[PDB]
Design a binder for this molecule. Structure first.
Ligand SMILES: Nc1ncnc2c1ncn2[C@@H]1O[C@H](COP(=O)(O)O)[C@@H](O)[C@H]1O
Length: 421
């Protein structure tokens, strides 16, 4: 079907498991000649050449890319995007998949995203910020309870009653941090239902849906403890109906891409909708402007289509249908004890050699030294397995995980548990 230029040098920006997953996929493309990741990490060195340049060193990255004749740059994390790498690259004539600074604002500013979804009729949790008690009060009292109250400067209360919400909102203003605008309180609609991650390739108004993943954000078994970058994920997600999926594509993803374009911020890249499946249909929690982590590690193994060709087709504004395997994929994050708090580095990791070769081991935060492996970051590794069903992928993933010994790491035993229940 689609022809593109073969023997294309590709650069991936980032250092994590998402970027291990995007490099591992890229390396399998019949289109790719040379594959660099800047800065990557020692498990990524197995699939790609590492480049010792920071993600935020935009001028070095531009100079590296001109000089090593990079045909495609794919940006992993959001900070480079929020800093204008795409803008710099385009002005230099370098081809890049990722949003402009102005488009990436959809993730950077939750206020801006709320503002855009309100103006364009996009379903989401109601959101409002106040520096006045009396105005906070009058608003809490129209909206009623349960209600989220958020204090700046733990400070998140899901107030079960109106009286509690007011007590919490009053405290937020009296004890929260005094910014240059005074103290402020954030009030949000509480939503119930099942969370899901809906990513799509986007170029302007053109939206190309990926598979649907579910992430597990809480640190501990039974969705306990604080929130994290994500402790595991799987795809597909059988308890989210096709109808909910289509509602979210037509009432959320397609209108956000339009809204960004209508505001003179067209988006190019991965638009990642963090969603709730409510009784009333799907509702935005947040938007992200790039692949989710650990969502990329579980979605990208299911993609049949060549990843580099799909990116090029998207950048060209070409027609494309993405093809996916029937097999489910589930992934478990091993994190350094203490994460998402203060965590210890430098614990020896044994047993990486013992893992079956069809297991997918995505390095996020490891170091290699004197021929051994050590923890070096909050999320350290993700192990995913494929399975004919979700339960089989769950079984495979956990069985393989147990080959790893590290007294400095922990992981959730309940990834996927509800979905199989
Ligand atoms: N309005 C909401 N309704 C339900 N869950 C939420 C809401 N906001 C945040 N969360 C949860 O808290 C996590 C952290 O997102 P955030 O609160 O924007 O940092 C999300 O990934 C959700 O799992």
């Amino acid at each position: 079907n689609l022809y593109f230029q073969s023997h294309m040098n590709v650069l991936v920006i980032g250092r994590g498991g998402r970027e291990h997953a995007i490099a591992w996929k890229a390396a399998q493309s019949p289109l790719v000649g040379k594959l660099y990741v800047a800065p990557g990490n020692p498990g990524i060195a197995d699939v790609a050449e590492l480049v010792h340049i920071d993600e935020l060193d935009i001028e070095a990255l531009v100079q590296f890319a001109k000089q090593q004749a990079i045909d495609l740059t794919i940006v992993g994390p959001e900070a480079p995007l929020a800093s204008g790498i795409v803008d710099r690259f385009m002005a230099e004539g370098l081809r890049i998949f990722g949003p402009s600074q102005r488009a990436a604002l959809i993730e950077g500013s939750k206020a801006f995203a709320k503002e855009l979804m309100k103006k364009y009729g996009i379903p989401t949790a109601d959101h409002a910020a106040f520096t006045s008690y009396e105005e906070a009060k009058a608003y809490i009292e129209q909206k009623g309870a349960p209600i989220v109250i958020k204090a700046d400067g733990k400070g998140v209360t899901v107030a079960q009653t109106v009286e509690e919400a007011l007590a919490a909102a009053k405290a937020a203003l009296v004890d929260g941090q005094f910014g240059t605008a005074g103290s402020q309180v954030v009030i949000e609609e509480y939503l119930e239902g099942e969370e899901f991650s809906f990513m799509a390739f986007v170029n302007g108004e053109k939206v190309y849906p990926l598979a649907i993943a579910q992430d597990h954000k809480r640190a501990y078994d039974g969705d306990e403890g604080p929130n994290t970058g994500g402790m595991g994920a799987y795809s597909p997600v059988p308890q989210i109906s096709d109808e909910m999926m289509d509602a979210a594509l037509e009432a959320i993803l397609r209108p956000a891409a339009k809204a960004l374009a209508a505001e003179g911020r067209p988006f190019l890249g991965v638009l990642y909708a963090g969603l709730m499946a409510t009784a009333n249909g799907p509702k935005v929690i947040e938007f992200n402007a790039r692949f989710g982590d650990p969502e990329a590690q579980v979605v990208l193994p299911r993609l049949k289509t060549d990843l580099v060709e799909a990116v090029l087709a998207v950048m060209d504004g070409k027609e494309l249908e993405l093809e996916w395997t029937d097999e489910a994929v589930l992934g478990v994050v091993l994190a350094a004890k203490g994460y998402p708090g203060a965590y210890e580095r430098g614990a020896e990791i044994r047993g990486l050699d013992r893992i079956s070769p069809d297991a997918l081991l995505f390095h996020a935060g490891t170091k290699r030294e004197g021929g051994a492996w050590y923890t070096n970051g909050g999320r350290v590794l993700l192990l995913a397995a494929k399975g004919e069903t979700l339960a089989k992928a769950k079984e495979k993933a956990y069985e393989q995980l147990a080959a790893i010994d590290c007294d400095g790491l922990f992981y959730r035993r309940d990834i996927g548990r509800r979905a199989i229940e």
